[PDB]
Amino acid sequence: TENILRKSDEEIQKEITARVKALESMLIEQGILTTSMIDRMAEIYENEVGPHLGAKVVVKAWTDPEFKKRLLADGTEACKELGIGGLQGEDMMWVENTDEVHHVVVCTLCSCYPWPVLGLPPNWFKEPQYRSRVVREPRQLLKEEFGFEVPPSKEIKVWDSSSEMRFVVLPQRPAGTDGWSEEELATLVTRESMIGVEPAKAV
């Protein structure tokens, strides 16, 4: 949105870059930050940890009723069965979409997000536009921003991550997928479907 007071994006980037390099130089001199530490963190969340992990959890729940029960009982412990867990998903609570209930998750106070199953959040999740509106007008927001119409008779539950409990949505399994393999099913599972802003992919 227009702000006549705001510098260009290019000027903002130039200034941030200098500030960050300056701070970086000082933390390096203190011996608490190194180039390898930086590269390792980046590599993990660029290449290793991402929503393909949550997808594996989802499709196991879809194809294994006992695992699904365990997942809903204790998200952290269930995900550890798949070697999935860790930073900012130490405490996971999965919630199940049904014909009667739709779940959507938010961190209104900041940006909290279940990194071990979804990786780092997309910028829109962290930004004030989504965070402000989704607790107040979720039905309208889902329709207008995501093209996702939840009938008024269906309950929408919005989960605001104010604690270290991390909420993850188990989307409903799309129709027409009877007997599909876990690999085939995983193609239907999106980051968005595990946030609750979209259903899993149809067809």
Which 108-137 residues touch other proteins, going by CB under 8 A?
108-111, 116, 119-120, 122-124, 126-133, 135-137
Nearest distance, CB of residue 2 and Co ion, angstroms: 27
- Pick the closest to residue 114 from 194, 200, 196, 172 (CA basis): 194
Tokens standing for residue 140: 């309208």
Q: Does the protein bind Co ion through residue 106 (CB under 5 A)?
A: no
- The region of 3-11, 63-71, 171-179, 182-190 touching other proteins under the rule CB under 8 A is 3-11
Q: At 170, phi and psi to the nearest 5?
A: -90, 100
User: Would you say 79 is a known binding-site residue?
Assistant: no
Compute the residue count for the chain.
203
- Buried-state track 140-166, b at ≥16 Cβ within 10 A, e below 16: ebbeeeeebebeeeeebebbebeeeeb
User: Would you say 111 is a known binding-site residue?
Assistant: yes
Between CA 38 and CA 49 the distance in angstroms is 16
Residue 107 among the catalytic residues: yes
Provide the sign of the torsion angle of the four alpha carbons 144, 108, 87, 104, taken in this order.
negative
Exactly one of 49, 79, 93, 112 binds Co ion (CB under 5 A); which one? 112
When CB distances are held under 5 to 8 angstroms depending on the partner's kind, the choice from Co ion, other proteins, none that residue 33 binds is other proteins
**Which residue precedes each gap in the chain (C to N above 2.5 Å)?**
none
Residue 79 among the catalytic residues: no
- The region of 77-85, 105-113, 115-123, 135-143 touching Co ion under the rule CB under 5 A is 105-113
Tokens standing for residue 176: 């027409």
When CB distances are held under 5 to 8 angstroms depending on the partner's kind, the choice from other proteins, Co ion, none that residue 201 binds is none
Nearest distance, CB of residue 198 and other proteins, angstroms: 11
Nearest distance, CB of residue 82 and other proteins, angstroms: 13
- Pick the closest to residue 104 from 133, 75, 79, 74 (CA basis): 133
x/- mask, other proteins, residues 80-99, rule CB under 8 A, reads -----xxxxxxx-x------
Active site residues: 107, 110-112
User: Which stretches of the chain bind Co ion, using CB under 5 A?
Assistant: 107, 110-112
Binding residues for Co(2+): 107, 110-112
